[PDB]
Every structure is written in C-alpha cells, then in structure tokens.
Design a protein around this ligand. Structure first.
Ligand SMILES: C=C[C@@H]1C[C@]1(NC(=O)[C@@H]1C[C@@H]2CN1C(=O)[C@H](C1CCCC1)NC(=O)O[C@@H]1CCC[C@H]1CCCCCc1nc3ccccc3cc1O2)C(=O)NS(=O)(=O)C1CC1
Ligand SMILES: [Zn+2]
Length: 160
C-alpha cells in the first residue's frame, strides 16, 4: 500500500568522488566501502565531512558506524555456491564459488566492463549476502575470476 520506485534493492547506495566513483553497502547497521577507492584521504558524504572509523590497506576494508534502526543484510547461511554480483549499472550475473575469497566469472569480460562497480554486494539466491566486490583478476585485461572479502572477515575488523 503506497507509491514508490526502485524497490528492487534498498541496501545498496551509490556514491561518487571527485576522481573516483564506488558504491557502499549497509551490513550489520554499518556502511562498508572499499579502502583503495577512498584511501587515507577523507571524503564528504550527505551529512557532511566524516572521519573513517575502520581502515585496512592489507584487507582493503574501510567503512563507518551507523546508528541502529536501519535494515541490514546478513552473511550467507545456506551453502549457496551460485552468487549474483551487483554492478553500478544494476546488472546481475551468476558467479560460481571457487574459493572462500576467490571465485570464477561465468562470462569472461574486459576489466573496463566491470570497472566502477566496487562495493557491489554479492547476494546468494536465498537472499543472504556473502560479501562485497574488492578487486578484479585478469591476465591481459580480461577478467575471468573475481576476488571478494567474506562478511566474517569484516566482523573481525569491527571487533578490533
Ligand atoms: C574492475 C573493477 C575492480 C573493482 C576495482 N578494483 C581494482 O581495479 C583493483 C584495485 C587495484 C587494482 N585492482 C585489481 O583488481 C587488479 C586489476 C588488473 C588490471 C587492472 C587492475 N587485479 C589484481 O590485483 O588481481 C590480483 C590477481 C590475484 C587476485 C587479485 C588480488 C588483488 C588484491 C589487491 C587489490 C587492491 N587493494 C588495495 C588495498 C589498499 C590500497 C590500495 C589497493 C590497490 C589494489 O589494486 C575498481 O573498480 N576499483 S576503483 O578504485 O576504480 C573503485 C571506484 C570503483
Ligand atoms: Zn544465502
């Protein structure tokens, strides 16, 4: 009951910087984004200037803490090998699971086609999320496999 648009996904947000543009995902009431994108330099959001609360160059994980009361996604708890990757253009593609942090792409495409989609959260067909996109893997510019961080790893950083 009511009128609304773009109801396909509500846990995915879009953010653009002065020289780079990536996306962020709300997980466990905490917004997570890629660190190589923002980097040490801070970035102004919708509320205004903010300070990075979580940082990790080795894990390429960074984000901010949000207040409770907002819907959040959960880790995958159904052993779903097939996962869908969210792209900046709202595209959907099935990906086979070939490792905890590394997988294989069904359709081989150039890095440029999959460029500008960092932060795209991967959600299994059950509805739960497995992690977020981090870096693309290619031999001569063609991406055949993809690497992403699991949600469990993010929890370890938040605890510390
Ligand atoms: C195709 C899209 C990918 C998501 C994406 N990430 C990337 O492009 C990452 C960041 C760089 C190199 N890179 C890749 O994935 C490369 C590509 C091979 C040809 C072009 C580069 N492959 C690449 O390493 O492949 C290796 C092969 C084995 C697995 C994979 C491991 C790489 C992990 C390191 C990624 C990375 N992390 C950082 C953390 C902190 C500070 C700086 C970092 C810089 C990093 O790198 C991206 O779009 N990044 S972005 O900054 O433009 C953001 C705005 C969207
Ligand atoms: Zn699931």
């Amino acid at each position: 009951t009511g009128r609304d648009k773009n109801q396909v996904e509500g846990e995915v947000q879009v953010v653009s910087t002065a020289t780079q543009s990536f996306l962020a995902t709300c997980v466990n009431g905490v917004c997570w984004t890629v660190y190589h994108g923002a980097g040490s330099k801070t970035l102004a959001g919708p509320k205004g200037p903010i300070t990075q609360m979580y940082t990790n160059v080795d894990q390429d994980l960074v984000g901010w803490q949000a207040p409770p009361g907002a819907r959040s996604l959960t880790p995958c708890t159904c052993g779903s090998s097939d996962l869908y990757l969210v792209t900046r253009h709202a595209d959907v593609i099935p990906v086979r699971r070939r490792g905890d942090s590394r997988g294989s792409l069904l359709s081989p495409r150039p890095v440029s086609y999959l460029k500008g989609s960092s932060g795209g959260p991967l959600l299994c067909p059950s509805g739960h999320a497995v992690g977020i996109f981090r870096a693309a893997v290619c031999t001569r510019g063609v991406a055949k496999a993809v690497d992403f961080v699991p949600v469990e790893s993010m929890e370890t950083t938040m605890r510390a």
